[PDB]
């Protein structure tokens, strides 16, 4: 409605609400999620070929 | 004729019995000076009290129409010179433009297509010919196959060895084809452009 | 009018979301531990080169067999490539040319391409007639399609400019749930392997995290000014990468709902254009305008390595399920292949 | 494609067909008839040839006897010869319009050049009110019984009426030959004779039935710019008596000899 | 006959004009100047070959952005080349062969034709298909299209025959603003850098300049014999270079409404069939119907230099509008890019 | 008029016009104008890239 500015009072509304479950969401310290990366990657760097070398008769681009 | 409220018409021979509202839509019109009870036109002959227009009812017919239920349909047995001549006798701006118009629609329909022909160019090499083109898509039709010469081993068994050149024609005449602007899809047209 | 007393809470909410996240800022110990795991210098080589394009590949998809990827091309043509053997599983010729999304379902028995078209089409590539066939137009988008992704065989997420990216259903052509909450035109997409969160990336620069099942949007993190041009999340569904226009990519995190990390250099003026992450996520894969494209230690926040090649820009990546080789899909109408 | 056998008897048919509606002749002649004439000529590609042939002919008709009979007037008044001369132009002029929309839509738009109907209406501007004997008799007669009106006669007001209408409409887009011909000479004589009249009046009469004497002559220039002036004229004239009878003798009013306004 | 006063006037205003134009004549500070930026003997070399065309070179004309320039050739085709790629943006097809111009939108979303047909074609460049589809068709010129520019991308100013340099708002396609007054047939045109005085030259050895709001002729210019094959305004919009089938070039200058300098030398009797402005003005770029063109100093009267590296005549010239570099476009079918 | 040379005082008309606006429109000295051009070119001659050179590593016709 255009006495309320073409209802920008409803996209208002929505931004307030997307803030609302923003603010409704916990946050988990950053150290800790961090901990959790370097725990995944540690754990799997010896399966990613990327930075381990894998044989040409183990990769489906050399046999 | 202008004594009455109905005006009977002896157009090509044939009599056209008419309110002379519908026939008075254009102030511009032959027709209007019809109506008045000037001395000026007098077409009717008293032996038969009906304007006598030198034009033929055959084109007559969708010009009435028109006058009678706004937009018209002209046939494509009919003649759209006829109903072209027809309009330019009967002095109307707005039924000559409609039939540009109509002219325009025939000449879109019958010379090109109702919505174009798209064509792309797949690449495959030799190799992989007999699949792709049987296994082309369902909706296109194969237009050509083009070697390509190389000093890959003689030019044969090269990873860019053919074009498959294919068509697409669409044939729905509602359809059309559709255009709309979009800014970041102008950048974006921009930049894989050049 | 009333908008006053919306825009002030609005206000101050977002200053409360700024305020918690920096409570949360504990500093990233990854970055700090930049000397454990070091990846030394890895230079891949390109053991495949999928040439046989002759248009600029705009995007590259794998498939879930890491062995067939649908690379679609400016001109509008949709190669399988099969990276086992260099050969085209298929060459579709698509309609309408200027697309930009070529979207692989997780059977492998649907493809989905969209463009300057405002319509997508879902293409069944598996049928008894050997050729590919039209399954579906998805139609009722206004705005260009920007990328797309199979949730199902028959749900399918359109991210596209209209500032819109409904879930559209395969099957009726009808939109399941849309997201309106953007503002600028959704032109990037991801898929956490969960896949009950869709983060999608838009020319707003706010990387918003989204309900597949409400409408309504999880989270919103904006760390960038620049437009999102790619996004990939990390191989636990926990966080995700993002490029934009700038030549700065960052790590946004779920959990902290931050800009976990950055990544940028004075050795690079172009921006991201691809975002990827390896088998483990520590390796981050950015294409660039430039014609060559990085690895980068994320979590060290330093480039692990260039990949070089091609003499125009790379315009999309994409590792293979199993992260054994990298597609380098860029616009010298050229495919390759690193590993 | 040959065409040409009846389009040269049709040149003679339709120019005699013009001179005869142009002299008030159209209770014989056939319109559908001059419609398809003037059509089928022109779809033929004849365009600056009858533009040419209606150039002149509309030219010397007017020159030949238009002007004559509008001056052998003097028993009569000369406003009414020119006003029914006019009025005749007009109804020639309409027909022929009407006759010439073909030309009027295809070959004008071309060769980038005038309609029918401004081109003609110049023509007779330029060979009737801008040619100087009608013009100075014109004005001679309006300024006569206009000044009679003034100073107070019965009149044919409907005679200056449909002149003056003329005079603003054979203009069209301007003003410019009604303002030159008479507008300006009558502006200027109601000033001349409005000082003088406020000059008597003021040393005549007092001060109040000075007053009503002047809203009356208010009332009266709007009676005869309704009745005997132009309708856009009511705004120039009335203003020249204000100027001429309070605006300026101002002193005047105020004092007076046992009246005025201090009286 | 009442036209013998009408030509005495006539005649007298024109002895008027002659009289005044002749007051403020005096010594032209460029001709007895020679120790100042004397431009000496510049050399170019061919940068770009835009070879590909299998016709005489019509018309060319340069983009605004000084990257894309559109040429037409004699069997009919525009070649909307990239200059530094030598690649072929779009090669459109043309609805009728015999086209002499090739009009190039500043936008470059629209460019425009016109030839032998007596039809101005107008296609949109840019849709969202890419295909580069007819917009507007412009019928009402008996005359055939001798030049045509665009005074905006939806409106255009066509010189033709007839006489007639017809002003056409695209859209909607009727003659908005109609124009008429020479008496030689219309055979060249240009516009001003102001964009708001179009100078005329037809056949009748005259340039009129013509103000493009209310239709008149603002002046009129007459100092070559000869018909007009082409004229160029200084980078100012207030004095044009004016090159016809005569080896005279003229500078013609509105201020003064004479002829500020000749360009003529016993060395060159071929027609100057184009002329051209460098970005400053110093150098007049002149394009023969020798197989070479050359250069003058604009404000020297001397041959600043010569392209020769053609074998037919220079159908058309053009400098950058960066002025950076110059394209020749020669009945060799061949364009060579002089830097 | 046509019988007056075919309405030729029309083209009398616009001549004469076109003579009056000329003769209305001021007359600058050639050396006053062709100052003003030298001042115009010179200020831009030492930034013209045909009369000063260009790096070939700046002209996108070099690189």
Redesign the interface.
């Known amino acids: 409605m255009a006495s309320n500015n073409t209802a920008s009072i409803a996209q208002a509304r929505k931004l307030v609400e997307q803030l609302k479950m923003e603010a409704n969401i916990d946050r988990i310290k950053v150290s800790k999620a961090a901990a959790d990366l370097m725990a995944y990657c540690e754990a799997h760097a010896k399966e990613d070929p990327l930075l381990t070398p894998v044989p040409a008769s183990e990769n489906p681009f050399r046999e | 004729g202008s004594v009455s409220k109905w005006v009977r018409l002896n157009v090509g021979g044939t009599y056209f019995l008419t309110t002379r509202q519908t026939l008075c839509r254009d102030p511009?019109s032959?027709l209007y000076?019809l109506c008045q009870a000037?001395?000026?036109?007098?077409?009717d002959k008293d032996e038969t009290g009906a304007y006598?227009?030198?034009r033929d009812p055959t084109y007559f017919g969708p010009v009435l129409n028109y006058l009678r239920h706004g937009k018209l349909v002209i046939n494509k047995d009919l003649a759209e010179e006829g109903v072209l001549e027809e309009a330019?006798?009967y002095?109307i701006?707005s039924l000559?433009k409609l039939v540009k118009d109509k002219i325009r629609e025939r000449d879109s329909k019958t010379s090109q297509v109702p919505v174009?022909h798209?064509y792309?160019?797949?690449?495959?090499?030799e190799?992989?010919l007999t699949q792709?083109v049987?296994?082309?898509?369902?909706?296109?039709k194969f237009e050509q196959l083009v070697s390509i010469g190389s000093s890959y081993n003689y030019g044969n068994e090269d990873?860019?060895e053919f074009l498959?050149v294919?068509s697409?024609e669409l044939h729905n005449t509602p359809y059309g084809?559709?255009?709309?602007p979009?800014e970041?899809?102008?950048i974006?047209?921009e930049r894989?452009?050049? | 009018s009333e908008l006053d007393q919306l825009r002030q809470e609005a206000e101050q909410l977002k200053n409360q979301i700024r305020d918690a996240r920096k409570a949360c800022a504990d500093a990233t110990l990854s970055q700090i531990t930049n000397n454990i795991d070091p990846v030394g210098r890895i230079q891949m080589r390109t053991r495949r080169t999928l040439?046989?394009?002759?248009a600029?590949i705009?995007a590259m998809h794998w498939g879930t067999d890491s062995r067939l990827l649908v690379s679609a091309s400016?001109?509008?043509?949709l190669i399988i490539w099969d990276s086992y053997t260099?050969?085209?599983v298929?060459?579709?010729?698509?309609?309408?040319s200027?697309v930009?999304t070529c979207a692989y379902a997780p059977s492998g028995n649907y493809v989905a391409c969209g463009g300057?078209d405002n319509i997508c089409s879902i293409?069944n590539l598996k049928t008894r007639?050997?050729?590919?066939?039209?399954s579906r137009e998805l139609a009722g988008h206004?705005?260009?399609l920007s990328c797309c992704r199979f949730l199902d065989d028959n749900q399918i997420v359109t991210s596209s400019?209209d500032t819109t990216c409904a879930l559209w259903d395969i099957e009726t052509g009808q939109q399941t749930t849309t997201f309106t909450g953007h503002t600028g035109?959704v032109?990037s997409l991801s898929l956490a392997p969960d896949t009950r969160l869709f983060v999608s990336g838009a020319?707003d620069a706010s990387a918003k995290l989204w309900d597949v099942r409400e409408g309504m949007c999880r989270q919103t993190f904006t760390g960038h000014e620049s437009d999102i041009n790619a996004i990939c999340f990390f191989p636990n569904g926990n966080a995700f990468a993002t490029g934009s226009d700038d030549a700065t990519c960052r790590l946004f995190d779920l959990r902290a709902d931050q800009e976990l990390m950055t990544y940028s250099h004075d050795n690079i003026i172009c921006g991201i254009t691809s975002v990827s992450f390896s088998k483990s996520g520590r390796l981050l894969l950015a294409g660039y305008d430039d014609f060559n494209c990085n690895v980068w230690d994320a979590l060290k926040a330093d480039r692990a390595g260039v990949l070089a090649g091609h003499d125009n820009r790379v315009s999309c990546l994409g590792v293979t399920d199993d992260g054994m080789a990298v597609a380098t899909g860029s616009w010298d109408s050229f495919l390759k292949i690193w590993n | 494609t040959m065409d040409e056998k009846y389009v040269n008897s049709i040149w003679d048919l339709l120019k005699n067909a013009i001179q005869e509606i142009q002299r008030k002749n159209?209770?014989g002649?056939?319109?559908?008839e001059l419609?398809?004439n003037a059509?089928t000529m022109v779809?033929h590609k004849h365009g600056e040839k009858l533009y040419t042939g209606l150039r002149e002919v509309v030219t010397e008709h007017l020159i030949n006897k238009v002007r004559e009979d509008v001056l052998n007037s003097l028993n009569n008044n000369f406003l009414q010869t020119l006003n029914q001369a006019w009025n005749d132009h007009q109804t020639a002029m309409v027909?022929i319009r009407?006759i010439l929309?073909?030309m009027d839509?295809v070959y004008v738009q071309q060769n980038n050049v005038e309609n029918v109907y401004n081109l003609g209406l110049i023509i007779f501007r330029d060979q009737v009110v801008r040619y100087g004997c009608i013009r100075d008799h014109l004005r001679q007669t309006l300024l006569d019984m206009i000044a009679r009106e003034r100073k107070g006669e019965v009149v044919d007001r409907g005679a200056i009426r449909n002149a003056c209408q003329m005079l603003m409409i054979l203009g069209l887009e301007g003003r410019s030959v009604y303002e030159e011909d008479f507008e300006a000479p009558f502006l200027e004589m109601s000033a001349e004779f409005f000082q003088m009249e406020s000059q008597k009046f003021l040393a005549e009469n007092s001060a109040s039935v000075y007053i009503k004497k002047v809203e009356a002559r208010i009332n009266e220039e709007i009676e005869r710019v309704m009745h005997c002036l132009d309708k856009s004229t009511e705004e120039p004239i009335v203003k020249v008596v204000e100027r001429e009878l309070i605006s300026k003798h101002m002193k005047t009013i105020v004092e007076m000899e046992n009246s005025g306004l201090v009286h």
Not at chain 2, 120 to 125: A, E, K, P, T, Y
Not at chain 3, 90 to 96: E, G, N, V
Not at chain 3, 129 to 134: A, I, Q, S, T
């Open positions: 511009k032959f000076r000037d001395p000026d036109l007098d077409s006598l227009i030198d330019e006798f002095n701006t000559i174009k798209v792309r160019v797949l690449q495959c090499q190799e992989e792709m049987s296994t082309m898509s369902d909706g296109w990873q860019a498959c294919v697409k084809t559709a255009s709309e979009s970041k899809a102008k974006l047209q894989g452009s050049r | 040439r046989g394009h002759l600029k705009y400016q001109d509008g043509k260099t050969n085209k298929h060459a579709i010729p698509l309609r309408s200027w930009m300057l293409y007639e050997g050729n590919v066939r039209v206004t705005g260009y400019g035109d032109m020319c | 159209n209770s002649l056939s319109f559908e419609y398809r059509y779809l027909m009407d929309m073909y839509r």
